[PDB]
Amino acid sequence: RTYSKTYSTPKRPYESARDLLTRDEKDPKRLFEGNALIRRLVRVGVLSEDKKKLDYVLALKVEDFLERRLQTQVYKLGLAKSVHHARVLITQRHIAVGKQIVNIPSFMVRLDSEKHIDFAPTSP
Template identity: 40%
Template sequence: MGDPKKMKKHYESPKKPLERSRLEEERKIVTEYGIRRKKEIRRLETIIRDLRRRARTLIATKDEKESKILIEKVIKMGLLAKSNPVLEDILGIELKDILERRLQMLIVKKGLANTVLQARQFITHGHITVDGQKIISPNYIVTMAEESGIVFRPTSSLNATFKRVEKREDREKREAKEALEKKARETTDKKEAQLAEIVDEEAIKEVESDIV
C-alpha cells in the first residue's frame, strides 16, 4: 500500500530532464510565468498529455458521446477558443495555453497584481478568492466560468491598499489616444472658427447690400 505519509506524485517526469533545449525552455517559462518549482510545469505537462492521450483514443474509437464530453471539458478549461472545435484541436494544445489559464497569470491580466511574482505572493498569502473560495495555489487552473469570480478576499487588507501600477505599454496607448482626441478637438474647433468667420462675412455682405 505504500507509506501513507508520503504524498503520491501527480505528474510524469520527462524522459530527458537534463536535455539542454528543455532546460533553456523551462528557464524561460520560470521567468515569464513566475514559477518557483519545476514540478508545477510537470503537472501542467501531465494534464496536457492526458488530454491528448484521451483525444487520440476517442479519435480511434469514434465514441461521439465521450468525444463531446471531452471537448466540452477542454472548452470550460479555456484551452480551446475556436468555434466548433473537434478532437484533433485538442492534439494541438500547447503548454503555453494552459500556463495562461493559471490563477497567477489571470490575476495579473485582471489588474489585481502588477507582476507575476506579486501575484504569486498574493495567492500564497491567502488574499485571493475564486467564486468565494480562497485559493492558495498559484498553479490553480481557472475555468472560463470562474474567471469573473477572481477577486481579493473581502477581509483582505489589499482591498484598501493595493494600487495598480500602469504598465509602460498601457501608458503609451493611453497617451497616444489622448493625443489623438486632443488633435481631433483642435481640428473641430478650428473648423468651427472658420465656419463662424464665413458666416460673419456673409452677414456683413448682406448688410452692405441692404444699405446700397
Template identity: 40%
Template sequence: RMGVLPVTGGDLNAILVLQNEDILSRRLQTIVFQKGLATTIKQARQLINHGHIFVDGHKVTVPGYIVLREEEGSVSYNPASPFTDEMHPMRAGPGAAPAAAPAPVEEAEETAEPAEEAN
C-alpha cells in the first residue's frame, strides 16, 4: 500500500531486505524532485512548504509526507500556483536558454580575424 514492497511476487521475506532508502524514497519531497516538478531536492522542499504542491487534489505542506502508491500519480502543482505556467523562470531547466543570450563564439571570432590581418 505504501509502495515500498514489490507489487507482484510479494513475499514476507521482502520486508527483511528493506533499506532506509526505500522508505525515504516515498517522501513527498523526493517524489516531487523525481517527477521533475523541482530542479533540486531543496527546491522541492521549498515548493511543498509554500503550498505549491497538491497530492490527490489537496494541498500538502509537509515535505516528509509519505506518498502512497495510489497517490503518486496525482502529485502535481497547485492549480493556483504561478508554477503551473511553463514559462515561469523557476521552472526553466538547465537546458533552457537565458532571456538575453550572449553572441555566439563563432561570430566573435569572425570579427576578430580582420583586426589581426590589419597588423
C-alpha cells in the first residue's frame, strides 16, 4: 500500500519530483479517509478507466470512491473500530446497509445512507 510495517505506513510518506506528486494526492486524502491500493487505483483510471472517461474534478472523484467503500467510512461512524476490521465486517456480511446484507465484499456503496448491523450479530 506504500509501505512497511503497521505504524510506519502513513509516516514514511508524510501525514495521517515524481514521488512527491503521487504522495500529494495520497496523504491529505488519507487524512479524511485512507484505503488506497496500487493495482486497484490503475482501474479507477490513473492509467485506465473512469478518470480518463470523465473530465470532472479528478481529485474529488478519488474522494468519492473511498467514502462509497463501506470499509473506510464505518471508521467515521465508530461502530467497527478499525479500517481493516471493517475489512472483515463487510466480508462476513455483518454491516447491513438498507438494511440489506452485502453481496460482494468489494461493495461500492455510499456514505449518506444509514449504517447498522444486521439483527443477530448486533453488538458483540
